[PDB]
Amino acid sequence: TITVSTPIKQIFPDDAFAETIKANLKKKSVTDAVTQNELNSIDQINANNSDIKSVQGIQYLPNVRQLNLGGNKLHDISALKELTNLGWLNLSSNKIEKLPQGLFESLTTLTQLNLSNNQITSLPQGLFESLASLTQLNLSNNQITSLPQGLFESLTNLTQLNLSNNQITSLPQGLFESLTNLTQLNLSNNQITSLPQGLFESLTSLTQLNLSNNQITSLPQGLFESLTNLKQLNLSGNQIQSLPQGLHESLTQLT
Incomplete structure:
Protein backbone atom coordinates (compact mmCIF):
# COMPACT_ATOMS: atom_id res chain seq x y z
CA THR A 1 0.00 0.00 0.00
CA ILE A 2 1.34 3.36 -1.14
CA THR A 3 -0.68 6.42 -0.14
CA VAL A 4 0.76 9.02 -2.53
CA SER A 5 1.45 8.83 -6.28
CA THR A 6 4.95 7.35 -6.51
CA PRO A 7 7.47 6.80 -9.35
CA ILE A 8 7.73 3.20 -10.60
CA LYS A 9 11.53 3.38 -10.24
CA GLN A 10 11.32 3.87 -6.48
CA ILE A 11 8.81 1.07 -5.73
CA PHE A 12 10.56 -1.40 -8.01
CA PRO A 13 14.31 -0.63 -7.75
CA ASP A 14 15.13 -3.34 -10.32
CA ASP A 15 15.47 -1.53 -13.67
CA ALA A 16 14.33 -4.58 -15.61
CA PHE A 17 11.34 -5.11 -13.30
CA ALA A 18 10.44 -1.41 -13.20
CA GLU A 19 10.34 -1.51 -16.99
CA THR A 20 8.15 -4.59 -16.68
CA ILE A 21 5.63 -2.70 -14.52
CA LYS A 22 5.74 0.30 -16.86
CA ALA A 23 4.85 -1.67 -20.00
CA ASN A 24 2.25 -3.53 -17.95
CA LEU A 25 0.52 -0.34 -16.72
CA LYS A 26 0.74 1.29 -20.16
CA LYS A 27 3.07 4.07 -19.01
CA LYS A 28 5.52 6.29 -20.88
CA SER A 29 8.40 6.03 -18.38
CA VAL A 30 9.62 4.29 -15.21
CA THR A 31 9.91 7.75 -13.68
CA ASP A 32 6.14 8.16 -14.12
CA ALA A 33 4.23 7.89 -10.85
CA VAL A 34 1.53 5.28 -10.17
CA THR A 35 -1.46 5.03 -7.84
CA GLN A 36 -2.25 2.10 -5.56
CA ASN A 37 -5.41 1.70 -7.63
CA GLU A 38 -3.16 1.27 -10.65
CA LEU A 39 -1.06 -1.27 -8.73
CA ASN A 40 -4.26 -3.10 -7.73
CA SER A 41 -5.12 -3.30 -11.44
CA ILE A 42 -2.34 -5.79 -12.11
CA ASP A 43 -3.65 -9.34 -12.41
CA GLN A 44 -0.76 -10.86 -14.36
CA ILE A 45 2.91 -10.28 -15.10
CA ASN A 46 4.68 -12.02 -17.96
CA ALA A 47 8.40 -11.29 -17.73
CA ASN A 48 10.29 -14.39 -18.86
CA ASN A 49 13.97 -13.88 -19.75
CA SER A 50 14.10 -10.18 -18.82
CA ASP A 51 17.22 -10.20 -16.61
CA ILE A 52 15.26 -9.48 -13.45
CA LYS A 53 17.46 -9.73 -10.34
CA SER A 54 14.87 -8.55 -7.79
CA VAL A 55 11.08 -8.31 -7.55
CA GLN A 56 11.16 -5.87 -4.65
CA GLY A 57 7.95 -3.88 -4.98
CA ILE A 58 5.84 -6.87 -6.04
CA GLN A 59 4.45 -6.87 -2.46
CA TYR A 60 2.33 -3.87 -3.51
CA LEU A 61 0.39 -5.91 -6.08
CA PRO A 62 -2.31 -7.70 -4.05
CA ASN A 63 -4.22 -9.00 -7.08
CA VAL A 64 -1.56 -10.85 -9.12
CA ARG A 65 -2.84 -14.33 -9.92
CA GLN A 66 -0.43 -15.19 -12.72
CA LEU A 67 3.32 -14.75 -12.57
CA ASN A 68 5.73 -15.87 -15.32
CA LEU A 69 9.27 -15.12 -14.08
CA GLY A 70 11.09 -17.96 -15.81
CA GLY A 71 14.64 -17.49 -17.06
CA ASN A 72 15.56 -14.51 -14.89
CA LYS A 73 18.17 -14.11 -12.14
CA LEU A 74 16.09 -14.25 -8.96
CA HIS A 75 17.88 -15.23 -5.75
CA ASP A 76 15.42 -13.96 -3.14
CA ILE A 77 11.67 -14.52 -3.53
CA SER A 78 10.63 -13.51 -0.01
CA ALA A 79 8.61 -10.63 -1.50
CA LEU A 80 6.17 -13.26 -2.82
CA LYS A 81 5.09 -14.26 0.70
CA GLU A 82 1.91 -12.19 0.97
CA LEU A 83 0.72 -12.46 -2.63
CA THR A 84 -2.41 -14.27 -1.41
CA ASN A 85 -4.13 -14.48 -4.82
CA LEU A 86 -1.33 -16.20 -6.71
CA GLY A 87 -2.60 -18.99 -8.99
CA TRP A 88 0.25 -19.78 -11.38
CA LEU A 89 3.87 -19.23 -10.38
CA ASN A 90 6.72 -19.91 -12.81
CA LEU A 91 10.12 -19.41 -11.21
CA SER A 92 11.92 -21.81 -13.54
CA SER A 93 15.54 -21.21 -14.49
CA ASN A 94 16.40 -18.60 -11.86
CA LYS A 95 19.13 -18.58 -9.17
CA ILE A 96 17.13 -19.99 -6.28
CA GLU A 97 19.32 -22.13 -3.96
CA LYS A 98 16.99 -22.54 -0.95
CA LEU A 99 13.38 -21.91 0.06
CA PRO A 100 12.62 -20.28 3.45
CA GLN A 101 10.25 -22.38 5.54
CA GLY A 102 6.85 -20.71 5.58
CA LEU A 103 7.34 -18.97 2.22
CA PHE A 104 4.17 -20.59 0.89
CA GLU A 105 2.06 -20.36 4.07
CA SER A 106 -0.41 -17.74 2.78
CA LEU A 107 -0.59 -18.85 -0.89
CA THR A 108 -3.75 -20.94 -0.44
CA THR A 109 -5.06 -20.39 -4.01
CA LEU A 110 -1.86 -21.48 -5.80
CA THR A 111 -2.51 -24.25 -8.33
CA GLN A 112 0.70 -24.35 -10.39
CA LEU A 113 4.26 -24.07 -9.09
CA ASN A 114 7.31 -24.35 -11.34
CA LEU A 115 10.68 -24.27 -9.58
CA SER A 116 12.53 -26.26 -12.23
CA ASN A 117 16.15 -25.74 -13.22
CA ASN A 118 17.19 -23.70 -10.18
CA GLN A 119 19.93 -24.69 -7.67
CA ILE A 120 17.77 -26.25 -4.97
CA THR A 121 19.49 -28.95 -2.93
CA SER A 122 16.79 -29.65 -0.28
CA LEU A 123 13.21 -28.77 0.67
CA PRO A 124 12.10 -27.98 4.21
CA GLN A 125 9.59 -30.49 5.51
CA GLY A 126 6.22 -28.78 5.51
CA LEU A 127 7.20 -26.26 2.79
CA PHE A 128 4.07 -27.21 0.85
CA GLU A 129 1.77 -27.82 3.85
CA SER A 130 -0.68 -25.04 3.03
CA ASN A 157 -5.31 -32.36 -5.43
CA LEU A 158 -1.97 -32.76 -7.28
CA THR A 159 -2.27 -34.10 -10.83
CA GLN A 160 1.29 -33.67 -12.15
CA LEU A 161 4.59 -34.15 -10.30
CA ASN A 162 7.97 -33.76 -12.01
CA LEU A 163 11.04 -34.69 -9.95
CA SER A 164 13.17 -35.66 -12.93
CA ASN A 165 16.86 -34.76 -13.49
CA ASN A 166 17.88 -34.42 -9.84
CA GLN A 167 20.27 -36.67 -7.86
CA ILE A 168 17.81 -38.64 -5.75
CA THR A 169 19.12 -42.02 -4.57
CA SER A 170 16.08 -43.32 -2.64
CA LEU A 171 12.34 -42.76 -1.99
CA PRO A 172 10.45 -43.09 1.33
CA GLN A 173 7.73 -45.76 1.03
CA GLY A 174 4.84 -43.44 1.97
CA LEU A 175 6.04 -40.45 -0.10
CA PHE A 176 3.13 -40.49 -2.58
CA GLU A 177 0.51 -41.81 -0.16
CA SER A 178 -1.84 -38.78 -0.41
CA LEU A 179 -1.77 -38.21 -4.20
CA THR A 180 -4.90 -40.12 -5.13
CA ASN A 181 -5.53 -37.78 -8.07
CA LEU A 182 -1.96 -37.88 -9.46
CA THR A 183 -1.95 -38.68 -13.18
CA GLN A 184 1.66 -37.97 -14.14
CA LEU A 185 4.78 -38.82 -12.11
CA ASN A 186 8.20 -38.22 -13.66
CA LEU A 187 11.10 -39.67 -11.69
CA SER A 188 13.51 -40.13 -14.60
CA ASN A 189 17.22 -39.25 -14.65
CA ASN A 190 17.94 -39.61 -10.92
CA GLN A 191 20.20 -42.10 -9.11
CA ILE A 192 17.51 -44.33 -7.60
CA THR A 193 18.77 -47.84 -6.94
CA SER A 194 15.52 -49.50 -5.74
CA LEU A 195 11.78 -49.03 -5.22
CA PRO A 196 10.10 -50.14 -1.96
CA GLN A 197 7.01 -52.31 -2.28
CA GLY A 198 3.89 -50.22 -1.91
CA LEU A 199 5.39 -46.99 -3.20
CA PHE A 200 2.63 -46.79 -5.88
CA GLU A 201 -0.21 -48.35 -3.87
CA SER A 202 -2.33 -45.20 -3.53
CA LEU A 203 -1.91 -43.90 -7.08
CA THR A 204 -4.98 -45.47 -8.68
CA SER A 205 -5.41 -42.41 -10.91
CA LEU A 206 -1.89 -42.62 -12.40
CA THR A 207 -1.68 -42.73 -16.22
CA GLN A 208 2.03 -42.05 -16.87
CA LEU A 209 5.01 -43.24 -14.82
CA ASN A 210 8.55 -42.41 -15.94
CA LEU A 211 11.34 -44.22 -14.08
CA SER A 212 13.81 -44.16 -16.98
CA ASN A 213 17.57 -43.58 -16.64
CA ASN A 214 18.03 -44.51 -12.96
CA GLN A 215 20.13 -47.23 -11.30
CA ILE A 216 17.51 -49.92 -10.93
CA THR A 217 18.54 -53.55 -11.50
CA SER A 218 15.37 -55.31 -10.31
CA LEU A 219 11.74 -54.67 -9.45
CA PRO A 220 9.71 -56.25 -6.62
CA GLN A 221 6.71 -58.39 -7.55
CA GLY A 222 3.36 -56.63 -7.89
CA LEU A 223 4.94 -53.18 -7.80
CA PHE A 224 2.60 -51.91 -10.51
CA GLU A 225 -0.51 -54.00 -9.76
CA SER A 226 -2.57 -51.22 -8.19
CA LEU A 227 -2.04 -48.92 -11.21
CA THR A 228 -5.26 -49.83 -13.07
CA ASN A 229 -5.32 -46.66 -15.18
CA LEU A 230 -1.69 -46.76 -16.32
CA LYS A 231 -1.20 -45.78 -19.99
CA GLN A 232 2.63 -45.39 -20.10
CA LEU A 233 5.44 -47.04 -18.11
CA ASN A 234 8.96 -46.02 -19.06
CA LEU A 235 11.72 -48.19 -17.55
CA SER A 236 14.32 -47.71 -20.30
CA GLY A 237 17.88 -46.77 -19.39
CA ASN A 238 17.97 -49.03 -16.34
CA GLN A 239 19.18 -52.62 -16.33
CA ILE A 240 16.38 -55.05 -15.64
CA GLN A 241 14.79 -58.26 -16.97
CA SER A 242 14.23 -58.39 -20.75
CA LEU A 243 10.82 -57.03 -21.85
CA PRO A 244 8.76 -56.91 -25.08
CA GLN A 245 8.23 -53.47 -26.62
CA GLY A 246 4.85 -52.06 -25.57
CA LEU A 247 2.89 -51.30 -22.39
CA HIS A 248 0.42 -54.21 -22.44
CA GLU A 249 3.07 -56.84 -23.20
CA SER A 250 5.63 -55.44 -20.75
CA LEU A 251 2.96 -55.31 -17.99
CA THR A 252 1.80 -58.90 -18.53
CA GLN A 253 5.47 -59.95 -18.59
CA LEU A 254 6.23 -58.53 -15.15
CA THR A 255 2.86 -59.46 -13.65
Missing part, protein backbone atom coordinates in the same frame (compact mmCIF):
# COMPACT_ATOMS: atom_id res chain seq x y z
CA LEU A 131 -0.94 -25.64 -0.75
CA ALA A 132 -4.21 -27.59 -0.67
CA SER A 133 -5.11 -26.43 -4.19
CA LEU A 134 -1.85 -27.29 -6.01
CA THR A 135 -2.42 -29.37 -9.13
CA GLN A 136 1.00 -29.07 -10.78
CA LEU A 137 4.45 -29.15 -9.15
CA ASN A 138 7.73 -29.05 -11.08
CA LEU A 139 10.98 -29.53 -9.15
CA SER A 140 12.98 -30.99 -12.04
CA ASN A 141 16.57 -30.13 -13.00
CA ASN A 142 17.73 -29.08 -9.51
CA GLN A 143 20.27 -30.70 -7.13
CA ILE A 144 17.96 -32.63 -4.86
CA THR A 145 19.34 -35.74 -3.17
CA SER A 146 16.44 -36.69 -0.92
CA LEU A 147 12.76 -35.98 -0.25
CA PRO A 148 11.43 -35.94 3.30
CA GLN A 149 8.47 -38.29 3.87
CA GLY A 150 5.60 -35.90 4.40
CA LEU A 151 6.72 -33.38 1.76
CA PHE A 152 3.68 -34.02 -0.46
CA GLU A 153 1.19 -35.01 2.24
CA SER A 154 -1.14 -32.00 1.90
CA LEU A 155 -1.16 -32.01 -1.90
CA THR A 156 -4.24 -34.19 -2.25
Whole structure:
Protein backbone atom coordinates (compact mmCIF):
# COMPACT_ATOMS: atom_id res chain seq x y z
CA THR A 1 0.00 0.00 0.00
CA ILE A 2 1.34 3.36 -1.14
CA THR A 3 -0.68 6.42 -0.14
CA VAL A 4 0.76 9.02 -2.53
CA SER A 5 1.45 8.83 -6.28
CA THR A 6 4.95 7.35 -6.51
CA PRO A 7 7.47 6.80 -9.35
CA ILE A 8 7.73 3.20 -10.60
CA LYS A 9 11.53 3.38 -10.24
CA GLN A 10 11.32 3.87 -6.48
CA ILE A 11 8.81 1.07 -5.73
CA PHE A 12 10.56 -1.40 -8.01
CA PRO A 13 14.31 -0.63 -7.75
CA ASP A 14 15.13 -3.34 -10.32
CA ASP A 15 15.47 -1.53 -13.67
CA ALA A 16 14.33 -4.58 -15.61
CA PHE A 17 11.34 -5.11 -13.30
CA ALA A 18 10.44 -1.41 -13.20
CA GLU A 19 10.34 -1.51 -16.99
CA THR A 20 8.15 -4.59 -16.68
CA ILE A 21 5.63 -2.70 -14.52
CA LYS A 22 5.74 0.30 -16.86
CA ALA A 23 4.85 -1.67 -20.00
CA ASN A 24 2.25 -3.53 -17.95
CA LEU A 25 0.52 -0.34 -16.72
CA LYS A 26 0.74 1.29 -20.16
CA LYS A 27 3.07 4.07 -19.01
CA LYS A 28 5.52 6.29 -20.88
CA SER A 29 8.40 6.03 -18.38
CA VAL A 30 9.62 4.29 -15.21
CA THR A 31 9.91 7.75 -13.68
CA ASP A 32 6.14 8.16 -14.12
CA ALA A 33 4.23 7.89 -10.85
CA VAL A 34 1.53 5.28 -10.17
CA THR A 35 -1.46 5.03 -7.84
CA GLN A 36 -2.25 2.10 -5.56
CA ASN A 37 -5.41 1.70 -7.63
CA GLU A 38 -3.16 1.27 -10.65
CA LEU A 39 -1.06 -1.27 -8.73
CA ASN A 40 -4.26 -3.10 -7.73
CA SER A 41 -5.12 -3.30 -11.44
CA ILE A 42 -2.34 -5.79 -12.11
CA ASP A 43 -3.65 -9.34 -12.41
CA GLN A 44 -0.76 -10.86 -14.36
CA ILE A 45 2.91 -10.28 -15.10
CA ASN A 46 4.68 -12.02 -17.96
CA ALA A 47 8.40 -11.29 -17.73
CA ASN A 48 10.29 -14.39 -18.86
CA ASN A 49 13.97 -13.88 -19.75
CA SER A 50 14.10 -10.18 -18.82
CA ASP A 51 17.22 -10.20 -16.61
CA ILE A 52 15.26 -9.48 -13.45
CA LYS A 53 17.46 -9.73 -10.34
CA SER A 54 14.87 -8.55 -7.79
CA VAL A 55 11.08 -8.31 -7.55
CA GLN A 56 11.16 -5.87 -4.65
CA GLY A 57 7.95 -3.88 -4.98
CA ILE A 58 5.84 -6.87 -6.04
CA GLN A 59 4.45 -6.87 -2.46
CA TYR A 60 2.33 -3.87 -3.51
CA LEU A 61 0.39 -5.91 -6.08
CA PRO A 62 -2.31 -7.70 -4.05
CA ASN A 63 -4.22 -9.00 -7.08
CA VAL A 64 -1.56 -10.85 -9.12
CA ARG A 65 -2.84 -14.33 -9.92
CA GLN A 66 -0.43 -15.19 -12.72
CA LEU A 67 3.32 -14.75 -12.57
CA ASN A 68 5.73 -15.87 -15.32
CA LEU A 69 9.27 -15.12 -14.08
CA GLY A 70 11.09 -17.96 -15.81
CA GLY A 71 14.64 -17.49 -17.06
CA ASN A 72 15.56 -14.51 -14.89
CA LYS A 73 18.17 -14.11 -12.14
CA LEU A 74 16.09 -14.25 -8.96
CA HIS A 75 17.88 -15.23 -5.75
CA ASP A 76 15.42 -13.96 -3.14
CA ILE A 77 11.67 -14.52 -3.53
CA SER A 78 10.63 -13.51 -0.01
CA ALA A 79 8.61 -10.63 -1.50
CA LEU A 80 6.17 -13.26 -2.82
CA LYS A 81 5.09 -14.26 0.70
CA GLU A 82 1.91 -12.19 0.97
CA LEU A 83 0.72 -12.46 -2.63
CA THR A 84 -2.41 -14.27 -1.41
CA ASN A 85 -4.13 -14.48 -4.82
CA LEU A 86 -1.33 -16.20 -6.71
CA GLY A 87 -2.60 -18.99 -8.99
CA TRP A 88 0.25 -19.78 -11.38
CA LEU A 89 3.87 -19.23 -10.38
CA ASN A 90 6.72 -19.91 -12.81
CA LEU A 91 10.12 -19.41 -11.21
CA SER A 92 11.92 -21.81 -13.54
CA SER A 93 15.54 -21.21 -14.49
CA ASN A 94 16.40 -18.60 -11.86
CA LYS A 95 19.13 -18.58 -9.17
CA ILE A 96 17.13 -19.99 -6.28
CA GLU A 97 19.32 -22.13 -3.96
CA LYS A 98 16.99 -22.54 -0.95
CA LEU A 99 13.38 -21.91 0.06
CA PRO A 100 12.62 -20.28 3.45
CA GLN A 101 10.25 -22.38 5.54
CA GLY A 102 6.85 -20.71 5.58
CA LEU A 103 7.34 -18.97 2.22
CA PHE A 104 4.17 -20.59 0.89
CA GLU A 105 2.06 -20.36 4.07
CA SER A 106 -0.41 -17.74 2.78
CA LEU A 107 -0.59 -18.85 -0.89
CA THR A 108 -3.75 -20.94 -0.44
CA THR A 109 -5.06 -20.39 -4.01
CA LEU A 110 -1.86 -21.48 -5.80
CA THR A 111 -2.51 -24.25 -8.33
CA GLN A 112 0.70 -24.35 -10.39
CA LEU A 113 4.26 -24.07 -9.09
CA ASN A 114 7.31 -24.35 -11.34
CA LEU A 115 10.68 -24.27 -9.58
CA SER A 116 12.53 -26.26 -12.23
CA ASN A 117 16.15 -25.74 -13.22
CA ASN A 118 17.19 -23.70 -10.18
CA GLN A 119 19.93 -24.69 -7.67
CA ILE A 120 17.77 -26.25 -4.97
CA THR A 121 19.49 -28.95 -2.93
CA SER A 122 16.79 -29.65 -0.28
CA LEU A 123 13.21 -28.77 0.67
CA PRO A 124 12.10 -27.98 4.21
CA GLN A 125 9.59 -30.49 5.51
CA GLY A 126 6.22 -28.78 5.51
CA LEU A 127 7.20 -26.26 2.79
CA PHE A 128 4.07 -27.21 0.85
CA GLU A 129 1.77 -27.82 3.85
CA SER A 130 -0.68 -25.04 3.03
CA LEU A 131 -0.94 -25.64 -0.75
CA ALA A 132 -4.21 -27.59 -0.67
CA SER A 133 -5.11 -26.43 -4.19
CA LEU A 134 -1.85 -27.29 -6.01
CA THR A 135 -2.42 -29.37 -9.13
CA GLN A 136 1.00 -29.07 -10.78
CA LEU A 137 4.45 -29.15 -9.15
CA ASN A 138 7.73 -29.05 -11.08
CA LEU A 139 10.98 -29.53 -9.15
CA SER A 140 12.98 -30.99 -12.04
CA ASN A 141 16.57 -30.13 -13.00
CA ASN A 142 17.73 -29.08 -9.51
CA GLN A 143 20.27 -30.70 -7.13
CA ILE A 144 17.96 -32.63 -4.86
CA THR A 145 19.34 -35.74 -3.17
CA SER A 146 16.44 -36.69 -0.92
CA LEU A 147 12.76 -35.98 -0.25
CA PRO A 148 11.43 -35.94 3.30
CA GLN A 149 8.47 -38.29 3.87
CA GLY A 150 5.60 -35.90 4.40
CA LEU A 151 6.72 -33.38 1.76
CA PHE A 152 3.68 -34.02 -0.46
CA GLU A 153 1.19 -35.01 2.24
CA SER A 154 -1.14 -32.00 1.90
CA LEU A 155 -1.16 -32.01 -1.90
CA THR A 156 -4.24 -34.19 -2.25
CA ASN A 157 -5.31 -32.36 -5.43
CA LEU A 158 -1.97 -32.76 -7.28
CA THR A 159 -2.27 -34.10 -10.83
CA GLN A 160 1.29 -33.67 -12.15
CA LEU A 161 4.59 -34.15 -10.30
CA ASN A 162 7.97 -33.76 -12.01
CA LEU A 163 11.04 -34.69 -9.95
CA SER A 164 13.17 -35.66 -12.93
CA ASN A 165 16.86 -34.76 -13.49
CA ASN A 166 17.88 -34.42 -9.84
CA GLN A 167 20.27 -36.67 -7.86
CA ILE A 168 17.81 -38.64 -5.75
CA THR A 169 19.12 -42.02 -4.57
CA SER A 170 16.08 -43.32 -2.64
CA LEU A 171 12.34 -42.76 -1.99
CA PRO A 172 10.45 -43.09 1.33
CA GLN A 173 7.73 -45.76 1.03
CA GLY A 174 4.84 -43.44 1.97
CA LEU A 175 6.04 -40.45 -0.10
CA PHE A 176 3.13 -40.49 -2.58
CA GLU A 177 0.51 -41.81 -0.16
CA SER A 178 -1.84 -38.78 -0.41
CA LEU A 179 -1.77 -38.21 -4.20
CA THR A 180 -4.90 -40.12 -5.13
CA ASN A 181 -5.53 -37.78 -8.07
CA LEU A 182 -1.96 -37.88 -9.46
CA THR A 183 -1.95 -38.68 -13.18
CA GLN A 184 1.66 -37.97 -14.14
CA LEU A 185 4.78 -38.82 -12.11
CA ASN A 186 8.20 -38.22 -13.66
CA LEU A 187 11.10 -39.67 -11.69
CA SER A 188 13.51 -40.13 -14.60
CA ASN A 189 17.22 -39.25 -14.65
CA ASN A 190 17.94 -39.61 -10.92
CA GLN A 191 20.20 -42.10 -9.11
CA ILE A 192 17.51 -44.33 -7.60
CA THR A 193 18.77 -47.84 -6.94
CA SER A 194 15.52 -49.50 -5.74
CA LEU A 195 11.78 -49.03 -5.22
CA PRO A 196 10.10 -50.14 -1.96
CA GLN A 197 7.01 -52.31 -2.28
CA GLY A 198 3.89 -50.22 -1.91
CA LEU A 199 5.39 -46.99 -3.20
CA PHE A 200 2.63 -46.79 -5.88
CA GLU A 201 -0.21 -48.35 -3.87
CA SER A 202 -2.33 -45.20 -3.53
CA LEU A 203 -1.91 -43.90 -7.08
CA THR A 204 -4.98 -45.47 -8.68
CA SER A 205 -5.41 -42.41 -10.91
CA LEU A 206 -1.89 -42.62 -12.40
CA THR A 207 -1.68 -42.73 -16.22
CA GLN A 208 2.03 -42.05 -16.87
CA LEU A 209 5.01 -43.24 -14.82
CA ASN A 210 8.55 -42.41 -15.94
CA LEU A 211 11.34 -44.22 -14.08
CA SER A 212 13.81 -44.16 -16.98
CA ASN A 213 17.57 -43.58 -16.64
CA ASN A 214 18.03 -44.51 -12.96
CA GLN A 215 20.13 -47.23 -11.30
CA ILE A 216 17.51 -49.92 -10.93
CA THR A 217 18.54 -53.55 -11.50
CA SER A 218 15.37 -55.31 -10.31
CA LEU A 219 11.74 -54.67 -9.45
CA PRO A 220 9.71 -56.25 -6.62
CA GLN A 221 6.71 -58.39 -7.55
CA GLY A 222 3.36 -56.63 -7.89
CA LEU A 223 4.94 -53.18 -7.80
CA PHE A 224 2.60 -51.91 -10.51
CA GLU A 225 -0.51 -54.00 -9.76
CA SER A 226 -2.57 -51.22 -8.19
CA LEU A 227 -2.04 -48.92 -11.21
CA THR A 228 -5.26 -49.83 -13.07
CA ASN A 229 -5.32 -46.66 -15.18
CA LEU A 230 -1.69 -46.76 -16.32
CA LYS A 231 -1.20 -45.78 -19.99
CA GLN A 232 2.63 -45.39 -20.10
CA LEU A 233 5.44 -47.04 -18.11
CA ASN A 234 8.96 -46.02 -19.06
CA LEU A 235 11.72 -48.19 -17.55
CA SER A 236 14.32 -47.71 -20.30
CA GLY A 237 17.88 -46.77 -19.39
CA ASN A 238 17.97 -49.03 -16.34
CA GLN A 239 19.18 -52.62 -16.33
CA ILE A 240 16.38 -55.05 -15.64
CA GLN A 241 14.79 -58.26 -16.97
CA SER A 242 14.23 -58.39 -20.75
CA LEU A 243 10.82 -57.03 -21.85
CA PRO A 244 8.76 -56.91 -25.08
CA GLN A 245 8.23 -53.47 -26.62
CA GLY A 246 4.85 -52.06 -25.57
CA LEU A 247 2.89 -51.30 -22.39
CA HIS A 248 0.42 -54.21 -22.44
CA GLU A 249 3.07 -56.84 -23.20
CA SER A 250 5.63 -55.44 -20.75
CA LEU A 251 2.96 -55.31 -17.99
CA THR A 252 1.80 -58.90 -18.53
CA GLN A 253 5.47 -59.95 -18.59
CA LEU A 254 6.23 -58.53 -15.15
CA THR A 255 2.86 -59.46 -13.65
